[PDB]
Design a protein around this ligand. Structure first.
Ligand SMILES: Nc1ncnc2c1ncn2[C@@H]1O[C@H](COP(=O)(O)OC(=O)[C@@H](N)Cc2c[nH]c3ccccc23)[C@@H](O)[C@H]1O
Ligand SMILES: C[C@H]1c2c[nH]c3cccc(c23)S[C@H]1C(=O)O
Lengths: 334, 333
């Protein structure tokens, strides 16, 4: 059997080119090489209060965006997290193998606390435990995520090792899979800030479903450096704006950074932003065409969801049963 | 007919105080209420312990409750982890519980008993799961002791806060106010009540102790320096003999005035010998039922299977409403 890939995305907010470049691109590319399981984490999404109607619609939006990106339900398991109760069950049990300090030192918890100071709920605190549960349920070897999930991923390796040290090889120790380029896509007008699916000025964000014409406008106004003379060179430290555009172009065309640096020799930033805008506008145009064919067929969306949850429950229930014996529960009679 | 919910810790070494107080009270009311008994194994693992012991004690608790008179035809008795809806609603209710509500918990600060970053998240999140245990079943009434009062109030707050956003999904549970009546005090500390959780096991008589062991603890029971020895009820100066008369009367039904006249001209040796004899007689009938249930592994399986199925039909109904209200896509059937 192949090694197992698992990853998740929240059906909340509008997914960005950062989501694509940090995770989704790798998800598509791994579907043949490994046994991939991809999840829409609706139980994580509600740690930030959401309108109920939007959340149900956003769940179908995310699923159709997966399919438009090229996730194939005949190659990959795709499901909605809450359709598989074993995520909640293992999430509870792993709470007991997680220290309070580990959760209270989490960068994402601190950032979300500041941003959502009226709703600092315990799900927001417990978030990494459920995410560890989503991963360890499937005997996962690889987790493709962006760089902002690395602390969370390292906790789930710790929890896996802690549990294994007590009860034997019940879990696999997962390994992160974070791309060397486009792991932290930066904001267009503030290239020191990661591009956030929660930004309150949309001029920083390229949405995957946003109007391509509005997207080209944002990329043309991307903030570049004041190097004299201007030079299209890759350097994340002192040329943040330029390098972020190079990453974004690379993710659209498939050309390497050094091939792109050669192609832009003797070229200035206005030509660079225009090439990025044309490349990105083209991919979003094709992406949104596939998106709508999938999104408007809800009975197809329902079929993918059902088949995926059934495929996922088979695997999760094997692990959860082994956890429950490890720890001492009486097994439920059948 | 009101729904009543109680969690049974599958690690409680239950005493005669539990049995003649709360348990006797509820065994006699299974037809007046729709009672639900949940052995909380998912709560237990918040304190690290031996896996085999936890498995055995879960079955001991079940057989002990059946021995005390819990009728699985009348009431619902089940094991928490056999109903996934507890963990599911437990996670969802996390998203509606303030971090501060959980950190201001005295039970969390007490059961902490160490430094944070050495206290597991199960100990921190414990109250939300209790809230989930209660609300899944549309519970009207919860019997709680003083140490569980703060937990129940959080449950009531969560229910109301959830209802205010989504509609009447949850029933707001109430405490069950009236007390059992039976008074059972600690054997060496006759001012404080006998508790299942005392680390001094000589203060208690457990439900499975043999008569030779019952005598040892009864004979060492604190009494008073009153000359001459008089067997008379008075809680301020005869608190010790007062406990023994209370325990005896709890066991036999005899009134305190009838007991006082029964022990007119008797000394403290006859009172303790009569207390131990009466306690051991009650415990002998209790234990023979316990061993009958506990060794019938097929009977226990059938009770767990029936209980969990009964619990799931109620639990899933509530959970489906919760998820629809929250806005999840419902699971394709
Ligand atoms: N600017 C950016 N540049 C590069 N990558 C980025 C950028 N912004 C976001 N990402 C990545 O996109 C993925 C989706 O993030 P979510 O917030 O939906 O989702 C999250 O942040 C997870 N907690 C969801 C989750 C729950 N359980 C899991 C188990 C495995 C993996 C993931 C999960 C993520 O990989 C994130 O790193
Ligand atoms: C057993 C524990 C428990 C778990 N779920 C519930 C629900 C109601 C009452 C209680 C509980 S009582 C409580 C305790 O700590 O006494």
């Amino acid at each position: 059997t192949k090694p197992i890939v698992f990853s998740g995305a929240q059906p909340s907010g509008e997914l960005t080119i950062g989501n694509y470049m940090g995770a989704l691109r790798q998800w598509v590319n791994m579907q043949d090489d490994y046994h991939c399981i991809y999840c829409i984490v609706d139980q994580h999404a509600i740690t930030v209060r959401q309108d109920a109607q939007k959340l149900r619609k956003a769940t179908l939006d995310t699923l159709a965006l997966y399919l438009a990106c090229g996730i194939d339900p005949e190659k990959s398991t795709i499901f909605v997290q809450s359709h598989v109760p074993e995520h909640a069950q293992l999430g509870w049990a792993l709470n007991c193998y997680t220290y309070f300090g580990e959760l209270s030192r989490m960068t994402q918890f601190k950032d979300k606390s500041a941003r959502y100071a009226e709703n600092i709920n315990a799900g927001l605190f417990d978030y990494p435990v459920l995410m560890a549960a989503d991963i360890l349920l499937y005997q996962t070897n690889l987790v493709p995520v962006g760089e902002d999930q690395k602390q969370h991923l390292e906790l789930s390796r710790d929890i896996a090792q802690r549990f294994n040290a007590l009860y034997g090889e019940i879990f696999k120790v997962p390994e992160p899979f974070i791309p060397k380029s486009g792991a932290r896509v930066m904001s267009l007008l503030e290239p020191t800030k990661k591009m956030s699916k929660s930004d309150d000025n949309r001029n920083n964000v390229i949405g995957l479903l946003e109007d391509p014409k509005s997207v080209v406008k944002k990329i043309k106004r991307a903030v570049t450096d004041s190097d004299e003379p201007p030079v299209v060179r890759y350097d994340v430290q002192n040329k943040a704006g330029v390098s972020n555009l190079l990453d974004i172009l690379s993710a659209v065309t498939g050309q390497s950074i050094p091939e792109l640096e050669k192609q832009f020799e003797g070229k200035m930033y206005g030509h660079l932003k225009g090439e990025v805008a044309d490349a990105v506008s083209g991919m979003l145009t094709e992406l949104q065409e596939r998106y709508h064919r999938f999104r408007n067929d809800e009975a197809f969306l329902q079929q993918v969801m059902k088949d995926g949850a059934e495929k996922a429950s088979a695997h999760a229930s094997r692990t959860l049963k082994a956890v429950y014996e490890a720890i001492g529960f009486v097994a439920k009679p059948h």
